[PDB]
Amino acid sequence: SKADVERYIASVQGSTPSPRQKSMKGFYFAKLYYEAKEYDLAKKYICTYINVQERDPKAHRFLGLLYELEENTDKAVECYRRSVELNPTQKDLVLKIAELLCKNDVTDGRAKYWLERAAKLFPGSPAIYKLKEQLLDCEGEDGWNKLFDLIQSELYVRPDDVHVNIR
Amino acid sequence: DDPGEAASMSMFSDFLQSFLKHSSSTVFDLVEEYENICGSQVNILSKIVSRATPGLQKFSKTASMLWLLQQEMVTWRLLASLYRDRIQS
Amino acid sequence: VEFPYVNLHNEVVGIIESRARAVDLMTHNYYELLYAFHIYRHNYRKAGTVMFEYGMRLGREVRTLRGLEKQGNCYLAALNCLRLIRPEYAWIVQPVSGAVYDRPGASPKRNHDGECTAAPTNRQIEILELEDLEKECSLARIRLTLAQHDPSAVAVAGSSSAEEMV
Amino acid sequence: IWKISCWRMAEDELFNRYERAIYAALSGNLKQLLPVCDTWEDTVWAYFRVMVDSLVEQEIQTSVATLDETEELPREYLGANWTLEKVFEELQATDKKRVLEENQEHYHIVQKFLIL
Amino acid sequence: VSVINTVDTSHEDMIHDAQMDYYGTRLATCSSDRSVKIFDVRNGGQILIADLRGHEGPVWQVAWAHPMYGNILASCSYDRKVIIWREENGTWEKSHEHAGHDSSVNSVCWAPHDYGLILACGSSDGAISLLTYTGEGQWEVKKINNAHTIGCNAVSWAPAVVPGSLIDHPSGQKPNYIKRFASGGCDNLIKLWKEEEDGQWKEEQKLEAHSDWVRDVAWAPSIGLPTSTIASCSQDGRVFIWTCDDASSNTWSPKLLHKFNDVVWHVSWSITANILAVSGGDNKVTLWKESVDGQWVCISD
Amino acid sequence: SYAGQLESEGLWEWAIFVLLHIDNSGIREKAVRELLTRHCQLLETPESWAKETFLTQKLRVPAKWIHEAKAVRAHMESDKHLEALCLFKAEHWNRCHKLIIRHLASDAIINENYDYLKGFLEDLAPPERSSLIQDWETSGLVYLDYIRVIEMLRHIQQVDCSGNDLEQLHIKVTSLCSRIEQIQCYSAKDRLAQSDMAKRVANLLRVVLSLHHPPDRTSDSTPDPQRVPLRLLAPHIGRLPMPEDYAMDELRSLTQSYLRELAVGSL
């Protein structure tokens, strides 16, 4: 519970002298508050680690997941974006940035740009098909032409189970 | 004419008699016996190459057959570990 | 000195450095004002770079006894402003001793057709580490030790090399 | 602190290449280990031995909350991304011509694909 | 024969050696005046590069390293020293000094570059030293004590491709470079030497045909030739050629080339191995050629 | 003997033609490489070029060994541009890259000679080549992304470019701050190049953000770089390797926009 995490973090900050060493434990303090659903105490302990380890892609990704669990779309995206800047191997996180942008604004040139970046890391992916479809339905008559060529060219990579043949 | 090229000619029937001893429920025992067959022939070929006078051109195939079956032996060893882990997991 | 340059530290240094590089070294103490300015701001590496340019200019323009005495004591001020720095950063940076500071207000050089013939100024750069200020301090002191024995050598020594000096 | 000391024993040119490699193979210093690995098998081993040691350090430094420790293990080794495919591209970027010729023979090719 | 140029070396005293660099662009000479002198000699011009002083006795041989390691020279002296010298940025300084000998060091010779940067040195105590560059200025030394009785006079390396010694190697392994060298001495012996699998050095073969002190010995470069060949000279005025016709037999045969009226001091192979130069004690050089009959003919009388 | 007769009167390319009739491969390779290692000049003269084209285009001599020889010659004649080049005429990019990053990059940045440094870096950048270059992403790519960020602003300062391209510019600047952070600076110059690259990037970030925060359509004024939210500047400027007087006027520019965030928060 909260009070067990608080009792552990009190004795573990007692067994720490200097402020920067307390900040260096902040990542683990933040995980324990998240495992109690204390999301602001998690945010508050990960930010007090990040302000002492500015470059850890895991801490930025954990702050992004805490903003996703506070429905704060572009703050989840900014912390995920910063985690991709600090470790570009995260193809999954390039896709998760497209996933949270197309769920915020369909007109956003960043949504379309991060989908571009996700497709160029995962071709032949039905999750990337539907993230294109959700933009192209909103591009109107100019959308419909691109949607026909998409449907043909990605069915040519996977014949679909139902949806794309009906569409 | 090389001795090595004459000495490894059983293994085409020895691997068959080892396959006809096992099943998919003893499919690692099969590869551990394949390492014992290749390691036995590596032992035989080493115990010929270690007895060749240096520079006798004929033993070129004996040395290539030794290294080929030594790399085969350790490739059966590799298979016997990684495909056991991947099935247990 | 004490705090009159909020937003403005980039201008005050450029104003004093351009004024210093235009004027006579024996008429206005601008290099010592700029040294004191950088020292008050704990910018010991800029203070030492300014004092080393001053000692280099003094031997190359000002062939007098007091010009050799300021060369030695300004090289000393530069050297001790490197001894106050970690060996990670304890070095000075200069154009090579033959590259041209074309002095402020000089008309740019031309062809006979009247173009500004700005040749590509390849910045070949002298780097001097802590030993090299011990070396030119030792030689400036010895230019002065010769001047404090032979008053005629003063007309030469201020920009002499080590083997000339031997 | 012992690995930080063993890494420091790997990087002064006054230590023997083999003593630098001994302490490197126990402290993650691939960069001082590859200077002794003079077969294909030694070169695959150098990558895999340090990949395990680096991933072990990443799980330990995520799970074991130490105190008072004021020195780092090098960010070239703590910040190391690893994959199996990557190791078998780095084994084709090497200058060691022997490894580039052995990484074209039939069983060494099978060994790459069975590991993948 | 035709002269290209005539160097005045400014040496005040007897020259003991004169060796060019691998390209024939520079010359090194050494003397009883304790100096080694380096010259540019390009196109029949001549210029002093250095007067290298820093031996304390007469200098008895010089040797250039292979240019794969950069501009490096070795020299050996009466004072028991071997000095290694290097050009960096265009100035020459001492890059090593080895005093580990119990008398005068009479000869020096570099290994083939294929073995690494290794020097061999022969001494008047009877020993030989080997100096291996380990990296970033350091040198391993190995000392073969008592390598000759009475004293060691000359050292010369075997070329890194021993003829025939490749036929059993399947396509894609490295050559196992069997490091060897020859040495002559005041025991009347030539001896062949090899590195074994522990890195220790061993007397592989003896060669016995001179009736007096062996002055010098030189191994032939294995360019085009399928045999292994050595020349050696003596205090009884002989020169012997030695062939080894099968590298698996290790069996050497002595062929008398000539017998002069006085001492022979030095033997020097052409870079194409097809010609031998021979330094006679009447101050002369003679030049010698192998025929298609395998007979040795003079080309300077 | 005939190959030596051909070397002696200077027909060394025909000494190779004779030595190429050696049936023994191990002697044939050594004899040809050893002879090439003497005769290949650093001056790629009409006569050297005629012999090199004869050897490669008639005799099929592998050109690797002509430049192996020119590299052993470039070691003896000390030219480390022709050594690095002739060792790349043997193989790999890395020798040009690790020369550039130590001996050209820092002076070229200090001279604002970006368009020259780019002329090397975009020939090294292609994925056929950069995938073979050690330490590329923390060195050559950092200098090159800095130049291409300056080029894309040099262009947006001249044309009606879109929000999609300013999104790209902000992403390219944000990708660069925590990478100037990571440059292998060796010399007295490299630390200066890195820190005015950082000073330039801190102020590129301001101009890029005031184009993301233009004013409402009631005054036809130019877009203020001091109106930029502190909330988007400080998390990226707090990684830039800048001297303490450069960081002081940056911190004063950040208190200036913070005071505008407070005054336009009391109305």
From Swiss-Prot, chain A:
TPR repeats lie at residues 23-56, 57-90, 91-125. The modification Phosphothreonine is found at residue 16. It is found in: Nucleus; Nucleus membrane; Nucleus, Nuclear pore complex; Nucleus envelope. Contains FG repeats. FG repeats are interaction sites for karyopherins (importins, exportins) and form probably an affinity gradient, guiding the transport proteins unidirectionally with their cargo through the NPC. FG repeat regions are highly flexible and lack ordered secondary structure. The overall conservation of FG repeats regarding exact sequence, spacing, and repeat unit length is limited. The PPIase cyclophilin-type domain has high structural similarity with PPIA, but has extremely low and barely detectable proline isomerase activity (in vitro). Only about half of the residues that surround the PPIA active site cleft are conserved. It is linked to Encephalopathy, acute, infection-induced, 3: A rapidly progressive encephalopathy manifesting in susceptible individuals with seizures and coma. It can occur within days in otherwise healthy children after common viral infections such as influenza and parainfluenza, without evidence of viral infection of the brain or inflammatory cell infiltration. Brain T2-weighted magnetic resonance imaging reveals characteristic symmetric lesions present in the thalami, pons and brainstem. The gene is RANBP2. The chain holds residues 4 to 170 of 3224 of the full protein.
Swiss-Prot record, chain B:
Changing residue 14 to Y: In NPHS11; no effect on interaction with NUP133; no effect on localization to the nuclear pore. It comes from the Eukaryota. Ubiquitously expressed in fetal and adult tissues. It is found in: Nucleus membrane; Nucleus, Nuclear pore complex; Chromosome, Centromere, Kinetochore. Belongs to the nucleoporin Nup84/Nup107 family. Part of the nuclear pore complex (NPC). Forms part of the Nup160 subcomplex in the nuclear pore which is composed of NUP160, NUP133, NUP107 and Nup96; this complex plays a role in RNA export and in tethering Nup98 and NUP153 to the nucleus. Does not interact with TPR. Interacts with ZNF106. It is linked to Nephrotic syndrome 11: A form of nephrotic syndrome, a renal disease clinically characterized by severe proteinuria, resulting in complications such as hypoalbuminemia, hyperlipidemia and edema. Kidney biopsies show non-specific histologic changes such as focal segmental glomerulosclerosis and diffuse mesangial proliferation. Some affected individuals have an inherited steroid-resistant form and progress to end-stage renal failure. NPHS11 is an autosomal recessive, steroid-resistant and progressive form with onset in the first decade of life. This is Nuclear pore complex protein Nup107. It comes from Homo sapiens (Human). The gene is NUP107.
Swiss-Prot record, chain C:
Signal peptide: none annotated. It comes from the Eukaryota. It is found in: Nucleus, Nuclear pore complex. The modification Phosphoserine is found at residue 107. It is linked to Nephrotic syndrome 19: A form of nephrotic syndrome, a renal disease clinically characterized by severe proteinuria, resulting in complications such as hypoalbuminemia, hyperlipidemia and edema. Kidney biopsies show non-specific histologic changes such as focal segmental glomerulosclerosis and diffuse mesangial proliferation. Some affected individuals have an inherited steroid-resistant form that progresses to end-stage renal failure. NPHS19 is an autosomal recessive, steroid-resistant form with onset in the first or second decade of life, resulting in chronic kidney disease. Part of the nuclear pore complex (NPC). Forms part of the NUP160 subcomplex in the nuclear pore which is composed of NUP160, NUP133, NUP107 and NUP96. This complex plays a role in RNA export and in tethering NUP98 and NUP153 to the nucleus. Functions as a component of the nuclear pore complex (NPC). Involved in poly(A)+ RNA transport. This is Nuclear pore complex protein Nup160. The chain holds residues 1051 to 1216 of 1436 of the full protein.
Swiss-Prot record, chain F:
The modification Phosphothreonine is found at residue 222. This is Nuclear pore complex protein Nup96. The chain holds residues 1551 to 1817 of 1817 of the full protein. It comes from Homo sapiens (Human). Transmembrane segments: none annotated.
